[PDB]
């Protein structure tokens, strides 16, 4: 069975270093060109680097944004592909995929020698977070329902879970008893290097004077738990 088993990556300070790895099974690793491709937040897929068989040189190519900071290497006897990341920058934060590559030779005579290079098998990815932050629990702030948050018979309220590191946080409402109408958004990594996310819920506006609404926040990496009651504010 073909498998590209990737490391856990992790968290590093700007200027630091990291070496994600990819250990393969199910195919002849030493006969296969390999690449790294990344997905930065918000942006799309972006090729990083490729390396050939050791016997071909190896031939190595790098994408311009990483040239001179990243080094791609391989250890055939272990079926391991490495990406040595040095002088890391917040722009390098991404999911990094290892890929087994193939070339499709062109059989049209005047293009003999050229090939179409493609990524034939992909790993599940390793997350690399470059941030100057240390472990830190969130502040929880209310998103208070009002007239400017009322849709006739429906009101929206929520909790802003701001400035924590690293992921993840869990958010529940009324200790798990309130699930309908909840939307907990993906966290965003702010320019500060800290995460923020919002959780919102919509409820009958008439229930605002009958039911209490509490968002239960738990950030296990910092051992921070907060219950925030959210009340209307006109």
């Amino acid at each position: 069975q073909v498998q590209l088993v990737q490391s856990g990556g992790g968290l590093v300070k700007p200027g630091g270093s990291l070496t994600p790895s990819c250990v393969t099974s199910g195919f002849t690793f030493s006969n296969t060109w390999m690449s790294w491709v990344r997905q930065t937040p918000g942006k799309g897929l972006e090729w990083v680097a490729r390396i050939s068989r050791v016997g071909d040189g190896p031939i190595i190519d790098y994408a311009a944004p990483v040239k001179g900071r990243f080094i791609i290497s391989r250890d055939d006897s272990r079926n391991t592909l490495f990406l040595h990341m040095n002088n890391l920058k917040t722009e390098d934060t991404a999911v990094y995929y290892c890929t087994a590559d193939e070339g499709a030779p062109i059989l049209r005579f005047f293009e003999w020698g050229y090939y179409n290079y493609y990524m034939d098998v992909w790993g599940k990815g390793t997350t690399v977070i470059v941030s100057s932050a240390s472990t830190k629990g969130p502040s929880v702030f209310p998103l208070a329902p009002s007239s400017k948050s009322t849709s006739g018979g429906t009101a929206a309220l929520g909790c802003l879970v701001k400035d924590y590191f690293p992921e993840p946080v869990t958010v529940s409402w009324n200790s798990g008893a309130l699930t309908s109408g909840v939307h907990t958004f993906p966290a965003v990594l702010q320019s500060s290097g800290l995460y923020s996310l919002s959780s919102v819920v919509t409820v009958p506006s008439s229930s605002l004077g009958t039911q209490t609404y509490i968002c239960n926040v738990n950030h296990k990496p910092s051992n921070t738990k907060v219950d925030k009651r959210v009340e209307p504010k006109s």
């Binding site: 002849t28 030493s30 006969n31 296969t32 060109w33 050939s52 068989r53 016997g55 071909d56 193939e102 070339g103 499709a104 030779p105 062109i106 059989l107 005579f109 005047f110 003999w112 020698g113 050229y114 090939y115």
Partner: peptide, 23 residues
């Protein structure tokens, strides 16, 4: 690893051979 002289052939060998032929 029985054969001491066994090596690998892949698509890149093909392309280099076709280039070498065209030229």
């Amino acid at each position: 690893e029985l054969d001491k002289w066994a090596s690998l052939w892949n698509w890149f060998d093909i392309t280099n051979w076709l280039w070498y032929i065209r030229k």
